[PDB]
Design a binder for this molecule. Sequence first.
Ligand SMILES: CN(CCCC1CCCCC1)C(=O)[C@H](CCC(=O)O)NC(=O)N(CC(=O)O)Cc1ccc(OP(=O)(O)O)cc1
Length: 102
Amino acid sequence: EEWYFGKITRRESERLLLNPENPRGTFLVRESETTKGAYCLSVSDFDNAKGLNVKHYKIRKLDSGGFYITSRTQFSSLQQLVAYYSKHADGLCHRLTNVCPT
Ligand SMILES: CN(CCCC1CCCCC1)C(=O)[C@H](CCC(=O)O)NC(=O)N(CC(=O)O)Cc1ccc(OP(=O)(O)O)cc1
């Protein structure tokens, strides 16, 4: 749905995400530019060394089966992946909050 930005670049996704109006955990999903066949979760975060920043998480997919950031926490679809990380961070920088406007 709405959060799937497709073939958007890393840099453009960082420019969209970095808007100060975006709360922590504003996100998108896109393709990986560098890993082909893979996806990325791009997430806004904040620390006080750097302020506003973005984290990117590689999404992989085992061949005949699950989508994953870490290999024991798998999901059958990208939908399930994102719906999970919106309930809990589970190791992520932040829980997923806002879909990115863009
Ligand atoms: C899968 N994990 C490892 C950690 C996963 C956690 C999840 C919670 C539970 C415990 C394990 C990653 O993905 C990490 C996540 C953030 C981080 O740990 O810092 N990110 C990463 O390794 N990056 C590469 C780098 O630093 O070289 C950043 C990056 C840059 C461009 C990009 O985009 P693209 O794919 O289009 O090139 C995609 C990624």
